[PDB]
Amino acid sequence: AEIQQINIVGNHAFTTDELISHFQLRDEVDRKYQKQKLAGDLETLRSYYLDRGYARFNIDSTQVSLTPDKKGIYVTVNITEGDQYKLSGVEVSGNLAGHSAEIEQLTKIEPGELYNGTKVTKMEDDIKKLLGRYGYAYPRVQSMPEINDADKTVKLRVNVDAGNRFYVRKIRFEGNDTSKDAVLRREMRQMEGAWLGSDLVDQGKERLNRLGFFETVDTDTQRVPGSPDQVDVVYKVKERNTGCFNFGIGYGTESGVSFQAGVQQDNWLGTGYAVGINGTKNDYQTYAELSVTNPYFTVDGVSLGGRLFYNDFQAYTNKSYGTDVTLGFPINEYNSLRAGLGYVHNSLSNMQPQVAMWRYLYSMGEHPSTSDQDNSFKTDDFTFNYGWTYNKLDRGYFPTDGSRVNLTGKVTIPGSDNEYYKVTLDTATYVPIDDDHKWVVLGRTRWGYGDGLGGKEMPFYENFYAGGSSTVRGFQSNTIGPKAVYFPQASNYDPDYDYECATQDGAKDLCKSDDAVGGNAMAVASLEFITPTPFISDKYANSVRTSFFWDMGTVWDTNWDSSQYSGYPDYSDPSNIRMSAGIALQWMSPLGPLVFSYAQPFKKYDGDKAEQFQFNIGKTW
């Protein structure tokens, strides 16, 4: 009962396969009773012919003929061809708005083009759209080609009626239950009590989608009953459950007493503030962090925010804390600037004797004794922070178009204990390759570099790390890059269970290790191919995304003394690029985002560690 073939009778300009290639019905890799596809194919065929100048094209009839015993279906269409017509020009008349120079310019064609029905439709939309920009809400545009058969040519008659102006009386919102009204009314570019334009109202949809709080934004321009020239623009939105309260406590005879808790919300009780509270404690490490951001301090877009943090760990011993405050503001529709100040204090003690750490220590005037763990250092740095951003993305959860650039960095203020600078750059681009935005090409890169001032090295605890589900998939987190080189003593670990090379007995020379130290510069890039979900219940169809990816990245150590350490791998060579590939799934669950991935590290080097099945809470993109 399946379709066996599609026959075309009377076609001479195109072959059977060329025309069938544009149908949704196909007899090869079958479908039955697809009435809607047959109708769509017949309309497609008509448009296909109209696009080539066949102004007289006509379909006389179609048949669908079932074979005996429901063995198959024959489909046939009867085609009458005409000829190709030239377009002589366009004559525009009617109640024009006084902007004939633009209406005429938008409709200009080059002499000798063939008639094209799609171009006529485009001309109509380019006239309704233009009039819709000055404030004519309901123009009437119609056209009719006059056919000159003797000269195989057409002339297009376009009739325009601008109608009248409309004004916006009230802008009302429906569907927001938690978000404060002052949030939605900061994003409308169309003001009440002024002329309507669609080029202004349509930006509200993009602005609200970029905010990222809502699942959908449905616009409307309902006309006011009993009034000739007024419209009520209404936005209907549905809020997503934005953030979460996470708490857990650990207890036992071997575990002791510990806890972890925090709260993260991008929208605090619906008032527009973003907050983050985190903290945890156990018997060897303490951490606390607080941050608050106000996206609107002033009505023009100035934003303020800042944070405080503290942590410490005891084994070496590492303690740190600090604060920062950032101010930012937009400079146009898509770009914005941030700048701010901060203070960081830290201390280290009982540092394990490593070459990478000590080269830095030497550069500051420190002189720890060789392989002597009896040591300390303190740092008090004042930092200036800055950043530039660009964001033209269409959505907050699963972008489909535009690009994003985030250029950030910081420099030491003179008088700080350390003297250095650090710059990073995230970029990402979405390119749709399908009109339904189900097939999308997604590229991402990360660049970074830091260095010191005055001949000093950058503090080692600011080094870059790479590898992990957030940066390069398939490697053990923070394992890509140079490893620590150990010196050959009087520790509390020497008796047993220690790192042999570091002990009094295990070694009398240098050795390589598996302990990542990161480095002064990094570059990472990845490509994902975003595809539609093979199958899922409709309920979750818009909450999941699947993709295939190919990742690469590299981290390398500037100022590596390859001459003094020639017996070991030279970490100054950037060419040792790590590469991986795999598949990933992203899901926006009722409890927040999750990312799952599987990757195989097909290209790896000495000391690399692999991890193939990974997932995390990305908080990225």
């Binding site: 459950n241 857990g248 406590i249 919300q265």
Partner: peptide, 25 residues
């Protein structure tokens, strides 16, 4: 290994013990 989901979009777990729960807003 005791756990519960007492309400939609609410999760609880009980399990030394490492009890935890989540609410999202």
């Amino acid at each position: 290994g005791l756990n519960a989901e007492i309400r939609d979009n609410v999760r609880f777990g009980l399990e030394a013990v490492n009890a935890n729960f989540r609410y999202c807003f």
